Amino acid sequence: QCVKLNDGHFMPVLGFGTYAPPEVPRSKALEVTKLAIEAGFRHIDSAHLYNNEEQVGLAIRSKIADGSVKREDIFYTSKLWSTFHRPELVRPALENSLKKAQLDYVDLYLIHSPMSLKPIFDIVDLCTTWEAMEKCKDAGLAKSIGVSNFNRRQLEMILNKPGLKYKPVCNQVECHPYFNRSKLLDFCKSKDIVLVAYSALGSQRDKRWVDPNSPVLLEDPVLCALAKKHKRTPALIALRYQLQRGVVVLAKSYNEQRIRQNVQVFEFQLTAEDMKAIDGLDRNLHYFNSDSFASHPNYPYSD
Ligand SMILES: NC(=O)c1ccc[n+]([C@@H]2O[C@H](COP(=O)([O-])OP(=O)(O)OC[C@H]3O[C@@H](n4cnc5c(N)ncnc54)[C@H](OP(=O)(O)O)[C@@H]3O)[C@@H](O)[C@H]2O)c1
Ligand SMILES: CC1=C(CC(=O)O)c2cc(F)ccc2/C1=C\c1ccc([S@](C)=O)cc1
């Protein structure tokens, strides 16, 4: 199914995450994005940062070419990287992501992060960045625009901007049973802003930003015990948890079996008691936990 965004467009509630670390051959993104679409994924999450937009757009275009899907059946997101926050850089950055993917438009374009970088940190009025995203939606380059990694105060800045034309349709943030974002989720729902969860499965645990001593979400005993009760898997429990909270959830897998497993999230449900047990896992744990973000003046978790 799909959720209706506050601008009238529609977002599929389960999305495929395309990020893989640079040790993975660029060509794997092409193969696993085709598998994801074959499996039933219709929402595809990419970013300038991921260095995979050529491969991901080819996968989408290839699945249009063989008649498996139409362009309008695919929801494709890209993101503005943080060295392009200056308003004059936003449109060219988007047109580059479009040229790489070879698409006429993205369904969704996000400010990837509030933590601006020199075009070394930068100081940018993100309200001006936002005005330039608005113009991109006006131009038809992005169907919808939104933000990623914004905390409540940074989102309020956008929402209270003098002469705002379009609300962010979404805030894409770290969100999973260890860090379930209940308060931010409530705030978003009160503004008809969709919360989209990334690292919903515990993150890739990349050693550059994630402490390998952090607990492994998918080994959690409550998730395991739920997975055994429903005869599903811990990953599926964690994904279904978000859908029943009204969260759009991403899932990265470069594995053929797992990509196909993840679509099973539509095939079952959890009870109130299951949901309450999962909500009781919350421990304020963001897996991305690095000096590279934490020392930034607009670090979202400075809270
Ligand atoms: N906006 C941002 O700042 C931001 C930040 C992080 C992520 N994201 C987006 O969100 C996407 C997903 O988040 P993430 O990359 O942190 O990964 P994730 O979705 O939390 O997945 C973590 C690991 O879960 C494994 N997995 C997938 N399905 C599984 C299953 N059924 N059972 C067991 N393990 C399974 C995957 O390993 P395998 O590949 O081996 O299956 C994956 O590497 C990202 O790729 C990117 O598209 C955005
Ligand atoms: C892999 C990665 C992600 C995850 C994703 O989007 O899937 C990410 C998300 C952000 F909001 C910001 C940075 C990153 C990132 C790599 C990265 C980290 C620090 C820097 S610099 C040293 O500040 C540059 C790049």
Side-chain angles (χ1 to χ4, degrees), residues 17-19 45 50 79 112 148-149 172 198-204 218 235 250-255 258 261-262 288:
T18 60
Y19 181 76
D45 188 76
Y50 303 164
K79 312 188 190 76
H112 196 152
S148 177
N149 293 303
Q172 181 189 126
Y198 74 67
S199 305
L201 296 188
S203 85
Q204 306 187 38
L218 298 190
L250 304 184
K252 177 270 189 184
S253 175
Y254 273 42
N255 172 275
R258 296 180 292 269
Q261 184 194 120
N262 290 347
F288 287 81

CSV table of all heavy atoms in Angstrom, one decimal, residues 17-19 45 50 79 112 148-149 172 198-204 218 235 250-255 258 261-262 288, ligand 1:
chain,number,residue,atom,x,y,z
A,17,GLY,N,16.4,0.2,0.4
A,17,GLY,CA,17.6,1.0,0.6
A,17,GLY,C,18.8,0.6,-0.3
A,17,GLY,O,19.1,-0.6,-0.3
A,18,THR,N,19.4,1.5,-1.0
A,18,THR,CA,20.4,1.3,-2.0
A,18,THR,C,21.8,1.5,-1.5
A,18,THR,O,22.7,1.2,-2.3
A,18,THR,CB,20.2,2.0,-3.3
A,18,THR,OG1,20.2,3.4,-3.1
A,18,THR,CG2,18.9,1.7,-3.9
A,19,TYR,N,22.1,2.0,-0.3
A,19,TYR,CA,23.4,2.3,0.1
A,19,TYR,C,24.2,1.0,0.3
A,19,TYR,O,23.7,0.2,1.0
A,19,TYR,CB,23.6,3.2,1.3
A,19,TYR,CG,25.0,3.5,1.6
A,19,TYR,CD1,25.7,4.4,0.8
A,19,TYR,CD2,25.7,2.8,2.6
A,19,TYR,CE1,27.1,4.6,1.0
A,19,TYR,CE2,27.1,3.1,2.9
A,19,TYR,CZ,27.8,4.0,2.1
A,19,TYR,OH,29.1,4.2,2.3
A,45,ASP,N,15.3,4.1,-2.6
A,45,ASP,CA,15.9,5.2,-1.8
A,45,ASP,C,17.4,5.4,-2.3
A,45,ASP,O,18.2,4.5,-2.1
A,45,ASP,CB,15.8,5.1,-0.3
A,45,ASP,CG,16.3,6.3,0.4
A,45,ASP,OD1,15.5,7.3,0.5
A,45,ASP,OD2,17.4,6.4,0.9
A,50,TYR,N,25.6,8.3,-2.4
A,50,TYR,CA,25.7,6.8,-2.5
A,50,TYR,C,26.6,6.4,-3.7
A,50,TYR,O,27.0,5.2,-3.7
A,50,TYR,CB,24.4,6.1,-2.5
A,50,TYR,CG,23.5,6.4,-1.3
A,50,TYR,CD1,22.2,6.1,-1.3
A,50,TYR,CD2,24.1,7.0,-0.1
A,50,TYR,CE1,21.3,6.5,-0.1
A,50,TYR,CE2,23.3,7.4,1.0
A,50,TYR,CZ,21.9,7.1,1.0
A,50,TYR,OH,21.1,7.4,2.1
A,79,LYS,N,18.8,12.6,-2.9
A,79,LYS,CA,19.0,13.5,-1.8
A,79,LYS,C,20.1,14.5,-2.1
A,79,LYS,O,21.2,14.1,-2.7
A,79,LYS,CB,19.4,12.8,-0.5
A,79,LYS,CG,18.5,11.6,-0.1
A,79,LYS,CD,18.8,11.1,1.3
A,79,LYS,CE,18.1,9.7,1.6
A,79,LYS,NZ,18.7,8.6,0.8
A,112,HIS,N,19.7,16.0,2.6
A,112,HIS,CA,20.2,14.8,3.2
A,112,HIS,C,20.5,14.9,4.7
A,112,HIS,O,20.3,13.9,5.5
A,112,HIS,CB,21.5,14.3,2.4
A,112,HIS,CG,21.8,12.9,2.6
A,112,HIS,ND1,22.5,12.2,1.7
A,112,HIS,CD2,21.7,12.0,3.7
A,112,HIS,CE1,22.7,10.9,2.1
A,112,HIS,NE2,22.2,10.8,3.3
A,148,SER,N,15.8,15.2,5.7
A,148,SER,CA,16.3,14.0,6.3
A,148,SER,C,17.2,14.4,7.5
A,148,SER,O,18.0,15.4,7.4
A,148,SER,CB,17.0,13.2,5.3
A,148,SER,OG,17.6,12.0,5.9
A,149,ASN,N,17.2,13.7,8.6
A,149,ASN,CA,18.0,13.9,9.8
A,149,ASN,C,17.7,15.3,10.5
A,149,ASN,O,18.6,15.8,11.2
A,149,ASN,CB,19.5,13.9,9.4
A,149,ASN,CG,19.9,12.4,9.1
A,149,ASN,OD1,19.8,11.5,9.8
A,149,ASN,ND2,20.5,12.3,7.9
A,172,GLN,N,13.2,11.9,6.9
A,172,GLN,CA,13.8,10.6,6.9
A,172,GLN,C,14.9,10.6,8.0
A,172,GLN,O,15.8,11.3,7.9
A,172,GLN,CB,14.3,10.2,5.5
A,172,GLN,CG,14.9,8.7,5.5
A,172,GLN,CD,15.6,8.4,4.2
A,172,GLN,OE1,16.9,8.1,4.2
A,172,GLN,NE2,15.0,8.5,3.1
A,198,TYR,N,15.1,5.0,8.5
A,198,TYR,CA,16.3,4.3,8.0
A,198,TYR,C,17.0,3.6,9.2
A,198,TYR,O,16.7,3.9,10.4
A,198,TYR,CB,17.2,5.3,7.3
A,198,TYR,CG,18.0,6.3,8.1
A,198,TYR,CD1,19.0,5.8,8.9
A,198,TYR,CD2,17.8,7.6,8.0
A,198,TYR,CE1,19.8,6.7,9.7
A,198,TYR,CE2,18.6,8.5,8.7
A,198,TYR,CZ,19.6,8.1,9.5
A,198,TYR,OH,20.3,9.0,10.2
A,199,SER,N,17.9,2.7,8.8
A,199,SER,CA,18.5,1.8,9.8
A,199,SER,C,17.4,1.1,10.6
A,199,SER,O,17.6,0.7,11.8
A,199,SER,CB,19.6,2.4,10.7
A,199,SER,OG,20.6,3.1,9.9
A,200,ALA,N,16.2,0.8,10.0
A,200,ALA,CA,15.1,0.1,10.7
A,200,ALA,C,15.6,-1.3,11.1
A,200,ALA,O,14.9,-1.9,11.9
A,200,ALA,CB,13.9,0.1,9.8
A,201,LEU,N,16.6,-1.8,10.5
A,201,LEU,CA,17.1,-3.2,10.7
A,201,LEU,C,18.3,-3.1,11.5
A,201,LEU,O,19.0,-4.1,11.7
A,201,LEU,CB,17.3,-3.9,9.4
A,201,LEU,CG,16.0,-4.1,8.6
A,201,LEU,CD1,16.4,-5.0,7.5
A,201,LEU,CD2,14.9,-4.8,9.4
A,202,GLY,N,18.7,-2.0,12.1
A,202,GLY,CA,19.9,-2.0,13.0
A,202,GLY,C,21.1,-1.4,12.3
A,202,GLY,O,22.2,-1.3,13.0
A,203,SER,N,21.0,-0.8,11.1
A,203,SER,CA,22.1,-0.2,10.3
A,203,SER,C,23.1,-1.3,9.7
A,203,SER,O,23.0,-2.5,10.1
A,203,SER,CB,22.9,0.8,11.2
A,203,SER,OG,24.0,0.1,11.9
A,204,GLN,N,24.0,-0.8,8.9
A,204,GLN,CA,25.0,-1.7,8.3
A,204,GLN,C,26.1,-1.9,9.2
A,204,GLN,O,27.0,-2.7,9.0
A,204,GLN,CB,25.4,-1.3,6.8
A,204,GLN,CG,24.1,-1.1,6.0
A,204,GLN,CD,24.4,-0.9,4.5
A,204,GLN,OE1,25.3,-1.5,4.0
A,204,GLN,NE2,23.7,0.0,3.9
A,218,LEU,N,19.1,-7.0,15.4
A,218,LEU,CA,18.4,-8.2,15.0
A,218,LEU,C,18.7,-9.5,15.9
A,218,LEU,O,18.1,-10.5,15.6
A,218,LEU,CB,18.6,-8.5,13.5
A,218,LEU,CG,18.1,-7.4,12.6
A,218,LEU,CD1,18.2,-7.9,11.1
A,218,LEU,CD2,16.7,-7.0,12.9
A,235,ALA,N,14.0,-9.4,11.4
A,235,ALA,CA,13.9,-8.3,10.5
A,235,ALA,C,12.5,-8.0,10.1
A,235,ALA,O,12.1,-6.8,10.2
A,235,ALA,CB,14.7,-8.6,9.2
A,250,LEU,N,12.3,1.9,5.4
A,250,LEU,CA,13.3,1.5,4.3
A,250,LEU,C,13.9,0.2,4.8
A,250,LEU,O,13.9,-0.1,6.0
A,250,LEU,CB,14.4,2.5,4.1
A,250,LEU,CG,13.9,3.9,3.8
A,250,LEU,CD1,15.1,4.8,3.6
A,250,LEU,CD2,12.9,4.0,2.5
A,251,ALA,N,14.4,-0.6,3.9
A,251,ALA,CA,15.2,-1.8,4.2
A,251,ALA,C,16.2,-2.0,3.1
A,251,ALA,O,15.9,-2.1,1.9
A,251,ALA,CB,14.3,-3.0,4.2
A,252,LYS,N,17.5,-2.0,3.6
A,252,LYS,CA,18.6,-2.3,2.6
A,252,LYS,C,18.9,-3.8,2.7
A,252,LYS,O,19.0,-4.3,3.8
A,252,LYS,CB,19.9,-1.5,3.0
A,252,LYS,CG,21.1,-1.8,2.1
A,252,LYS,CD,21.9,-3.0,2.8
A,252,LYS,CE,23.3,-3.3,2.1
A,252,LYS,NZ,23.9,-4.5,2.8
A,253,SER,N,18.9,-4.5,1.6
A,253,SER,CA,19.6,-5.8,1.5
A,253,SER,C,20.2,-5.9,0.1
A,253,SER,O,19.6,-5.5,-0.9
A,253,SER,CB,18.6,-6.9,1.7
A,253,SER,OG,19.3,-8.1,1.5
A,254,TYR,N,21.5,-6.4,0.1
A,254,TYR,CA,22.1,-6.7,-1.2
A,254,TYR,C,22.0,-8.3,-1.4
A,254,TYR,O,22.7,-8.9,-2.2
A,254,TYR,CB,23.5,-6.2,-1.3
A,254,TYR,CG,23.5,-4.8,-1.9
A,254,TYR,CD1,22.6,-3.8,-1.5
A,254,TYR,CD2,24.5,-4.4,-2.8
A,254,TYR,CE1,22.6,-2.5,-2.1
A,254,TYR,CE2,24.5,-3.1,-3.4
A,254,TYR,CZ,23.6,-2.2,-3.0
A,254,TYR,OH,23.8,-0.9,-3.6
A,255,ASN,N,21.1,-8.9,-0.6
A,255,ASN,CA,21.0,-10.4,-0.6
A,255,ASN,C,19.7,-10.8,-1.3
A,255,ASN,O,18.6,-10.4,-0.8
A,255,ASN,CB,21.2,-11.0,0.7
A,255,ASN,CG,20.9,-12.5,0.7
A,255,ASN,OD1,19.8,-13.0,0.8
A,255,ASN,ND2,22.0,-13.3,0.6
A,258,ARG,N,17.1,-12.3,1.2
A,258,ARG,CA,16.6,-11.3,2.1
A,258,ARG,C,15.7,-10.2,1.5
A,258,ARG,O,14.7,-9.8,2.1
A,258,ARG,CB,17.7,-10.7,3.1
A,258,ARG,CG,18.2,-11.9,4.0
A,258,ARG,CD,19.3,-11.5,4.9
A,258,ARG,NE,20.6,-11.1,4.3
A,258,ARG,CZ,21.6,-12.0,4.1
A,258,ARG,NH1,21.5,-13.3,4.3
A,258,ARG,NH2,22.8,-11.5,3.7
A,261,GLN,N,12.5,-11.9,1.2
A,261,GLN,CA,11.9,-12.0,2.5
A,261,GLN,C,11.2,-10.7,3.0
A,261,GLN,O,10.2,-10.7,3.6
A,261,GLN,CB,13.0,-12.4,3.5
A,261,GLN,CG,12.4,-12.7,4.9
A,261,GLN,CD,13.5,-12.8,5.9
A,261,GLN,OE1,13.6,-12.1,6.9
A,261,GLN,NE2,14.4,-13.8,5.7
A,262,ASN,N,11.9,-9.6,2.8
A,262,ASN,CA,11.4,-8.3,3.4
A,262,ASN,C,10.0,-7.9,2.9
A,262,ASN,O,9.3,-7.3,3.7
A,262,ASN,CB,12.4,-7.2,3.1
A,262,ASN,CG,13.7,-7.4,3.9
A,262,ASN,OD1,13.7,-8.2,4.8
A,262,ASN,ND2,14.7,-6.6,3.6
A,288,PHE,N,24.5,5.5,14.3
A,288,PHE,CA,25.5,6.5,13.7
A,288,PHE,C,25.9,7.4,14.9
A,288,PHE,O,25.1,8.2,15.4
A,288,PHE,CB,24.8,7.3,12.6
A,288,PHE,CG,24.6,6.5,11.3
A,288,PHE,CD1,23.6,5.7,11.2
A,288,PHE,CD2,25.5,6.7,10.3
A,288,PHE,CE1,23.4,5.0,9.9
A,288,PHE,CE2,25.4,6.0,9.1
A,288,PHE,CZ,24.3,5.1,8.9
B,1,LIG,N1,19.0,9.6,5.3
B,1,LIG,C1,20.1,9.1,5.8
B,1,LIG,O1,21.0,9.8,6.4
B,1,LIG,C2,20.3,7.6,5.8
B,1,LIG,C3,21.0,6.9,6.8
B,1,LIG,C4,21.1,5.5,6.8
B,1,LIG,C5,20.4,4.8,5.8
B,1,LIG,N2,19.6,5.5,4.8
B,1,LIG,C6,18.9,4.9,3.7
B,1,LIG,O2,18.2,3.8,4.5
B,1,LIG,C7,18.6,2.6,3.8
B,1,LIG,C8,18.6,1.4,4.8
B,1,LIG,O3,19.2,1.7,6.1
B,1,LIG,P1,20.8,1.0,6.4
B,1,LIG,O4,21.6,1.0,5.2
B,1,LIG,O5,21.3,1.6,7.7
B,1,LIG,O6,20.4,-0.5,6.5
B,1,LIG,P2,19.2,-1.4,7.2
B,1,LIG,O7,18.0,-1.2,6.4
B,1,LIG,O8,19.1,-1.1,8.7
B,1,LIG,O9,19.8,-3.0,7.1
B,1,LIG,C9,20.9,-3.4,8.0
B,1,LIG,C10,21.4,-4.8,7.4
B,1,LIG,O10,20.2,-5.5,7.5
B,1,LIG,C11,20.4,-6.7,6.7
B,1,LIG,N3,19.1,-7.3,6.2
B,1,LIG,C12,18.3,-6.8,5.3
B,1,LIG,N4,17.2,-7.6,5.3
B,1,LIG,C13,17.4,-8.6,6.2
B,1,LIG,C14,16.7,-9.7,6.6
B,1,LIG,N5,15.5,-10.0,6.1
B,1,LIG,N6,17.2,-10.4,7.6
B,1,LIG,C15,18.4,-10.2,8.2
B,1,LIG,N7,19.1,-9.1,7.8
B,1,LIG,C16,18.6,-8.3,6.8
B,1,LIG,C17,21.1,-6.1,5.5
B,1,LIG,O11,22.3,-7.0,5.2
B,1,LIG,P3,22.3,-7.7,3.7
B,1,LIG,O12,22.6,-6.6,2.6
B,1,LIG,O13,23.5,-8.7,3.9
B,1,LIG,O14,20.9,-8.5,3.5
B,1,LIG,C18,21.6,-4.7,5.9
B,1,LIG,O15,23.0,-4.5,5.6
B,1,LIG,C19,20.0,3.0,3.5
B,1,LIG,O16,20.5,2.1,2.6
B,1,LIG,C20,19.8,4.3,2.7
B,1,LIG,O17,19.0,4.0,1.5
B,1,LIG,C21,19.6,6.9,4.8
